RNA sequence: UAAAGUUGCUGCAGUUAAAAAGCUCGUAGUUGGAUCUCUCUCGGCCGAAGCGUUUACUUUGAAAAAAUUAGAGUGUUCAAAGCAGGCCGCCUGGAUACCGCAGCUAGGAAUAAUGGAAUAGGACCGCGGUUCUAUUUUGUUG
């Protein structure tokens, strides 16, 4: 079930058994790498890059063509973002909720949802600090987190 | 050219190298075989009277070998008539680390160096033109495991006659009995 | 969330055998599940089983021959010495004539009689009879 | 009922199941080569695309995102791969 | 650095540092021998102990303490005294009625010689038992293994 | 104390008999998915070292007062006991087991935790560069 909801949804991707490059796909691994570089330079997160490559260029899975994952490729080329995109989007959502709550002080539902969002933020940040992805002194403070956005 | 990793060439290895040099000098694919190389080769009985030629190839070249493996295997089968030919990448298995291993490991053994991964890759490469589409390990009452491999329907009758030498080669270099079959539902 | 995949597998086998079914599906598969199943099968309690290999975590289709009364797991995996084995047998097994306690020992996964033969102890995985 | 058995065919009972609940999971989607009548080259489009993709040589809306499978424009001939 | 930060003179008591100097006795260098000893049990004398200048009479390598008895291990949890740290030993205690365990810990104030610089919180220390050094200290840090995460 | 599975670790209950917090979040605690199979002086490949990756577990070996308990021998007239006694000077016992946890030790390596190589200040390999270096001067050292 969801971490912060009573939902028990099942909807997710189902990878095919075959791990090979599709026969239709004629892009070399380096071609996919350069397309990834271009999309990252455009200002896109790895999830967006994967979605675009799947929808338009027919790249069913970048890991199966290049032997590497999109975030690893971005890091190896040196153009990966400062903090992971899931944590970034969680902080962005928290910032939006706080901005809404500043001008709507009677919204208890917004306060409850903000509590849930910040709990998720803290859990993800602790995990990232454990993996040395974030500096050990990193902390999410709700005073200037809009700069992190 | 044959360059064994332990620099120990053999007479059969020499004959296979001579045949490959022959394809190197004049063939429709002479541009590729000049820069390519094989680590070893050997023959084995597979049951009855048929024979199989396992051509051991360095890993970095395997993909390139797989670019032209169909024509190469066709011509080498023609040169040897009734002995089937299979290209397998030369892969080493780093032993599972123990508490008593004197001096065999200084860095983490990669998962690609493990016995399970190496045997899976051997099974994948042994059947190259036909892609594996499923595996079933049936455990018999005596405890022995029989692997059933489902092969793609795009290339079935081109390698249907190969289902016999494939099991023989896998028994020879892996020790596991395996059956190869083709499913009706893709 | 699910811990103890072996508990799930054993409960599934038990529930299927109590309904009189001929096969049971087990997911996910694991090495411990396969060894426990092999121990069960060597004593004629289940029969042949097939390991379906998907690229994430396999499944097992276990053929059931209705000779199984109860296959169960013991959580936590208590450490069992050769002295405590008799007390565990009295607690778990329905008779001294049949039934097996499965242990994981440094010599592998084996029933309690085989652990007495090799003069070894270990951790209790479960039981079947 | 006697799973994974060839004696009783079940292509129809397997592609009816949920994709995750199958014996071996497999996607319900596909990639398709699309020709635009005004265009002259292939475009490989995902069936459940989430992007408004355009022709690689023009500015024509090939498909639009929907709740599930993407909706293709008229006249564009689409054929599944594999 | 000045090793004379005390009201009394700090020196190694077994080293004579004012043997007479003459023209032949000084040729551009004063020289100062360093007393150090090899403690037993396979522990190797750290380089900074041999080539250092600190004065520590409780140091196992250059001081006046004999390592005999228990050789234990711990995790550094506090470094806030002078030449002393607090390590934490974590163990499991077996309750027999329930056939189960419970987490327990004990803090240990152990002497850390100036020969171990760059010791962090979370580092593992092998300490050896010696004579009472203070009210609570009975163990001396013999070896330091850095926590996983060195890069 | 057992009966008391009416304190439930084994092993109890919690819709209505006594009982689930009004509801979420949340640190500690507890619990956590799959996955990795021939190296130091030798006069027996023929004495040895680990300098290498840690523990839990399990098995073993040391060490561990007696008395008590268990238990071997022994007709106290029997028995509780005792450590006696037996044979025609002699013969014989005064055993043995257990002794939990922690500590010590040595095999096993399933299970469970844990570790390395990801800006390579990574493994092996030979090269460029430094030292009184317990002798690289039976000759008084230089």
Curated annotation (Swiss-Prot), chain A:
Residues modified to N6-succinyllysine: 26, 33
GO CC terms: cytoplasm; cytosol; cytosolic ribosome; cytosolic small ribosomal subunit; extracellular exosome; focal adhesion; membrane; nucleolus
Pfam entry (one): Ribosomal_S13_N
Cross-link Glycyl lysine isopeptide (Lys-Gly) (interchain with G-Cter in SUMO2) residue location(s): 42
Subunit structure: Component of the small ribosomal subunit. Part of the small subunit (SSU) processome, composed of more than 70 proteins and the RNA chaperone small nucleolar RNA (snoRNA) U3.
Family: Belongs to the universal ribosomal protein uS15 family.
Protein name: Small ribosomal subunit protein uS15
Gene expressing this chain: RPS13
UniProtKB/Swiss-Prot annotation, chain B:
Modification after translation, per record: Phosphorylated by NEK6. Ubiquitinated. Deubiquitinated by DESI2, leading to its stabilization.
Pfam families from the UniProt entry: Ribosomal_S7e
Cross-link Glycyl lysine isopeptide (Lys-Gly) (interchain with G-Cter in SUMO2): residue positions: 63, 67
Modified residues (N6-acetyllysine): 67
Superkingdom, natural source: Eukaryota
Tagged with keyword Iron: no
Disulfide feature: none
Molecular-function GO terms, alphabetical: mRNA 3'-UTR binding; mRNA 5'-UTR binding; protein kinase binding; RNA binding; structural constituent of ribosome; ubiquitin ligase inhibitor activity
Record keywords: Acetylation, Cytoplasm, Cytoskeleton, Diamond-Blackfan anemia, Isopeptide bond, Nucleus, Ribonucleoprotein, Ribosomal protein, Ubl conjugation
Keyword Ribosomal protein listed: yes
One Gene Ontology cellular component annotation held by this UniProt entry: cytosolic ribosome
Places the protein is found: Cytoplasm, Cytoskeleton, Microtubule organizing center, Centrosome; Cytoplasm; Nucleus, Nucleolus
GO biological process, alphabetically ordered: cytoplasmic translation; negative regulation of ubiquitin protein ligase activity; negative regulation of ubiquitin-dependent protein catabolic process; neural crest cell differentiation; neural tube closure; positive regulation of gene expression; positive regulation of intrinsic apoptotic signaling pathway by p53 class mediator; protein stabilization
Function summary: Component of the small ribosomal subunit. The ribosome is a large ribonucleoprotein complex responsible for the synthesis of proteins in the cell. Required for rRNA maturation. Part of the small subunit (SSU) processome, first precursor of the small eukaryotic ribosomal subunit.
Family membership: Belongs to the eukaryotic ribosomal protein eS7 family.
UniProtKB/Swiss-Prot annotation, chain D:
Subcellular location: Cytoplasm; Nucleus, Nucleolus
Cofactor, free-text remark: Binds 1 zinc ion per subunit.
Amino acids binding Zn(2+): 36, 39, 55, 58
SUPFAM superfamilies: Zn-binding ribosomal proteins
Annotated region described as Disordered, given as residue ranges: 1-22
One annotated GO molecular function: DNA binding
Superkingdom of this protein's organism: Eukaryota
Major subcellular location class: cytoplasm
UniProt keywords, alphabetically: Cytoplasm, Diamond-Blackfan anemia, Metal-binding, Nucleus, Phosphoprotein, Ribonucleoprotein, Ribosomal protein, Zinc, Zinc-finger
Zn finger spans (C4-type): 36-58
Organ and tissue specificity: Expressed in a wide variety of actively proliferating cells and tumor tissues.
GO cellular component assignments: cytosol; cytosolic ribosome; cytosolic small ribosomal subunit; GABA-ergic synapse; glutamatergic synapse; nucleolus; nucleoplasm; nucleus
Basic and acidic residues bias spans: 1-15
UniProt modified residues of type Phosphoserine: 10
Required cofactor names: Zn(2+)
Pfam families: Ribosomal_S27e
Gene3D superfamilies for the chain: Zn-binding ribosomal proteins
Protein task: Component of the small ribosomal subunit. The ribosome is a large ribonucleoprotein complex responsible for the synthesis of proteins in the cell. Required for proper rRNA processing and maturation of 18S rRNAs. Part of the small subunit (SSU) processome, first precursor of the small eukaryotic ribosomal subunit.
Record-linked PANTHER family: 40S RIBOSOMAL PROTEIN S27 (PTHR11594)
Database matches in HAMAP family: Ribosomal_eS27
Family: Belongs to the eukaryotic ribosomal protein eS27 family.
Quaternary assembly: Component of the small ribosomal subunit. Part of the small subunit (SSU) processome, composed of more than 70 proteins and the RNA chaperone small nucleolar RNA (snoRNA) U3.
Name of the protein described by the UniProt record: Small ribosomal subunit protein eS27
Protein's organism: Homo sapiens
Curated annotation (Swiss-Prot), chain E:
Keywords for this protein: Acetylation, Citrullination, Cytoplasm, Lipoprotein, Methylation, Nucleus, Palmitate, Phosphoprotein, Ribonucleoprotein, Ribosomal protein, RNA-binding, rRNA-binding
Modification N6-acetyllysine occurs at: 37, 44, 57
Phosphoserine sites (modified residues): 66, 109
Post-translational modification: Citrullinated by PADI4.
Pfam families registered for this protein in UniProt: Ribosomal_S17, Ribosomal_S17_N
Tagged with keyword Ribosomal protein: yes
Name the UniProt record assigns to this protein: Small ribosomal subunit protein uS17
Organism: Homo sapiens
């Amino acid at each position: 079930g969801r971490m912060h909801a009573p939902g028990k949804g099942l909807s997710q991707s189902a990878l095919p058994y075959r791990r090979s490059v599709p026969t239709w796909l004629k892009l070399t691994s380096d071609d996919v790498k350069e397309q990834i570089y271009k999309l990252a330079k455009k200002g896109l997160t790895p999830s967006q890059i994967g979605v675009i490559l799947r929808d338009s260029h027919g790249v069913a899975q970048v890991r199966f063509v290049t032997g590497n994952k999109i975030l690893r490729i971005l890091k190896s080329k040196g153009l990966a973002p400062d903090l992971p995109e899931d944590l970034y989007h969680l902080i962005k959502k928290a910032v939006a909720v706080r901005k809404h709550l500043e001008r709507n002080r009677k919204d208890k539902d917004a306060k409850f949802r903000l509590i849930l969002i910040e709990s998720r933020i803290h859990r993800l940040a602790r995990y990232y600090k454990t993996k040395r992805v974030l500096p050990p002194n990193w902390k999410y403070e709700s005073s200037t987190a809009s700069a992190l956005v | 050219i044959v360059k064994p990793n332990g620099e120990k060439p053999d007479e059969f290895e020499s004959g296979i190298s001579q045949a490959l040099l022959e394809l190197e000098m004049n063939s429709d694919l002479k541009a590729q075989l000049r820069e390519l190389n094989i680590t070893a080769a050997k023959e084995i009985e597979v049951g009855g009277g048929r024979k199989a030629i396992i051509i051991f190839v360095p890993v970095p070249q395997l993909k390139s070998f797989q670019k032209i493996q169909v024509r190469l295997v066709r011509e080498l089968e023609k040169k040897f008539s009734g002995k089937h030919v299979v290209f397998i990448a030369q892969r080493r298995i780093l032993p599972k680390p123990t508490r008593k291993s004197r001096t065999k490991n200084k860095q983490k053994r990669p998962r690609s160096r493990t016995l399970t991964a190496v045997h899976d890759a051997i099974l994948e490469d042994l059947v190259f033109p036909s892609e594996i589409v499923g595996k079933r390990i049936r455990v018999k009452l005596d405890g022995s495991r029989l692997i059933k491999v489902h092969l793609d329907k795009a290339q079935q009758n081109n390698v249907e006659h190969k289902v016999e030498t494939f099991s023989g080669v896998y028994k020879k270099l892996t020790g596991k009995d395996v059956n190869f079959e083709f499913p009706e539902f893709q | 969330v699910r811990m103890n995949v072996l508990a799930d597998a054993l409960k599934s086998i038990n529930n299927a055998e109590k309904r009189g079914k001929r096969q049971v599906l087990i997911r996910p598969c694991s090495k411990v599940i396969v060894r426990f199943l092999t121990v069960m099968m060597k004593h004629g309690y289940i029969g042949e089983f097939e390991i379906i290999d998907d690229h994430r975590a396999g499944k097992i289709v276990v053929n059931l021959t209705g000779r199984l009364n109860k296959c169960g797991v013991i959580s936590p995996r208590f450490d069992v010495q050769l002295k405590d084995l008799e007390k565990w047998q009295n607690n778990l097994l329905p008779s001294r004539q049949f039934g097996f306690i499965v242990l994981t020992t440094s010599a592998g996964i084996m029933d309690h009689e085989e652990a007495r033969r090799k003069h070894t102890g270990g951790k209790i995985l479960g039981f079947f009879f | 009922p006697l799973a994974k058995d060839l004696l009783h065919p079940s292509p129809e009972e397997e592609k009816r199941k949920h994709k995750k609940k199958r014996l071996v999971q497999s996607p319900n989607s596909y990639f398709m080569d699309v020709k635009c009548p005004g265009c002259y080259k292939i475009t490989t489009v995902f069936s459940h695309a989430q992007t408004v993709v355009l022709c690689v040589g023009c500015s024509t809306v090939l498909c639009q995102p929907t709740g599930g499978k993407a909706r293709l424009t008229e006249g564009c001939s689409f054929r599944r791969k594999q | 650095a000045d090793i004379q930060t005390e009201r009394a003179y700090q020196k190694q008591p077994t080293i004579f540092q004012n043997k007479k100097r003459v023209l032949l006795g000084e040729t551009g260098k004063e020289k100062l021998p360093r007393y150090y000893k090899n403690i037993g049990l396979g522990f190797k004398t750290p380089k900074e102990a041999i080539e250092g200048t600190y004065i520590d009479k409780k140091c196992p390598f250059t001081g006046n303490v004999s390592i005999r008895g228990r050789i234990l291990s711990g995790v550094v949890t506090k470094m806030k005294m002078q030449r002393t740290i607090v390590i934490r030993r974590d163990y499991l205690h077996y309750i027999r009625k329930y056939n189960r365990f419970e987490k327990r810990h004990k803090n240990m104030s152990v002497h850390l010689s100036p020969c171990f610089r760059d010791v962090q919180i979370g580092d593992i220390v092998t300490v050896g038992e010696c004579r009472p050094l203070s009210k609570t200290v009975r163990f001396n840090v013999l070896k330091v293994t850095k926590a996983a995460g060195t890069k």
